[PDB]
Amino acid sequence: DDEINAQSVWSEEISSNYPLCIKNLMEGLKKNHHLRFFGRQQLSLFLKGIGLSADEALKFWSEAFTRNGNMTMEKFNKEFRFSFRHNYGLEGNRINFKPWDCHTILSKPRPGRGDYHGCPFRDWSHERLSAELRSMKLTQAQIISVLDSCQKGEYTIACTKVFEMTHNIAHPNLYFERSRQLQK
Ligand code: SF4
Numbered sequence: 288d289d290e291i292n293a294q295s296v297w298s299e300e301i302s303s304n305y306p307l308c309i310k311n312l313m314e315g316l317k318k319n320h321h322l323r324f325f326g327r328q329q330l331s332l333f334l335k336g337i338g339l340s341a342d343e344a345l346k347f348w349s350e351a352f353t354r355n356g357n358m359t360m361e362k363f364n365k366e367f368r369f370s371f372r373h374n375y376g377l378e379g380n381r382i383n384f385k386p387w388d389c390h391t392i393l394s395k396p397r398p399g400r401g402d403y404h405g406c407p408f409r410d411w412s413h414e415r416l417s418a419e420l421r422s423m424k425l426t427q428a429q430i431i432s433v434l435d436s437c438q439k440g441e442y443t444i445a446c447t448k449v450f451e452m453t454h455n456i457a458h459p460n461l462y463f464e465r466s467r468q469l470q471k
Contacts, residue, residue, distance in 0.1 A: 293347035304466035315403030320357035336386030389457035
């Protein structure tokens, strides 16, 4: 809990290790104080995978959903608490939901307006990707190479390129673990 907790998953240190899908989900959560079902699952199971405990997850999700009076804690408890507890087996279900790999993520229904699940390398325009990658300090040649992979439908190669270019078989939690090791 010292390293990964409801607070540190918002830190720059820990979030600098997130792949683009998780960054997108965290941004949608921060902006909207809510995520629709598929994004809730993609992000909550990723965070479980990096070691966010059940207690810290319930702190994280209830704080994020109730921010700015978006909903009362009563509403969170009546409409969402069970769903997050279920993801951690706290209601006795005896199914240990695993984090989604990239194939599972890509195989879910493609995101529409208001959805943040999926894979940005597939789901964003080249203009939106280039803007994000510029913000991550990549150069034009680097971005062209990433977009080359996206154009070919090779989304996990695009993501691997972004990893290589921002640092010194396909799974968001592997991206996180590899990146986190390079801080350590
Ligand atoms: S390739 Fe996988 S880890 Fe990378 S952004 Fe897409 S879904 Fe996330």
